[PDB]
Design a protein around this ligand. Sequence first.
Ligand SMILES: NCCCOc1ccc(-c2cn[nH]c2-c2cc(Cl)c(O)cc2O)cc1
Length: 212
Amino acid sequence: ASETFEFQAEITQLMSLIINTVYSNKEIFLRELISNASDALDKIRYKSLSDPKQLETEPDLFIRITPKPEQKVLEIRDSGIGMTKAELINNLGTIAKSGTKAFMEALSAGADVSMIGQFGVGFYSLFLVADRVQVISKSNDDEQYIWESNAGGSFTVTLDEVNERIGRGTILRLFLKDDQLEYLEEKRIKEVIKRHSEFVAYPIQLVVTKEV
Ligand SMILES: NCCCOc1ccc(-c2cn[nH]c2-c2cc(Cl)c(O)cc2O)cc1
């Protein structure tokens, strides 16, 4: 069962700009996604204090990055609180309206794209290196769902029936642009991670497949 929704105008406009903008330091995208993953983890951690049973679906709290060269895909996973179907719809397709509108105005005034995080809409920076994204999420309060968008003004939400079932959390599956495959490389990914992840209180796992 697939369902389609339209983004709030302001969000679509920001996405159009980001996916086409010529930025020379696109690696900032990872910083934003790592920060969001950390926030999701803090949320499940906090809630587990009085309700530890919430952790049983996925006992370990972590962030995991897995590049998939064969598919020109980069996955950023966290075992955070996750998002129900309603949360995916609202969080990624509506609530960012004000932040995106303000950031667009900031950019028009000369702001740098690296300021996106200051406006609470860092998520959309992924379109600097990807032309399509699948958000696979599993909240303890709902079934596993897939949110997907290619920056076409609309997005779809589908009951996950093809991906691996995760205990709890969210996976950002980025379909990298042909000229942004450097982020599939271990060395490159490692340097980008260490450059801004000093604050992360959770372990950041890197899964790489190398031939011996
Ligand atoms: N104004 C700042 C916006 C960031 O705030 C958050 C931070 C985390 C979440 C949240 C809850 N469950 N999953 C997420 C979540 C959201 C995004 Cl976009 C992400 O890349 C990873 C996540 O784990 C939701 C909102």
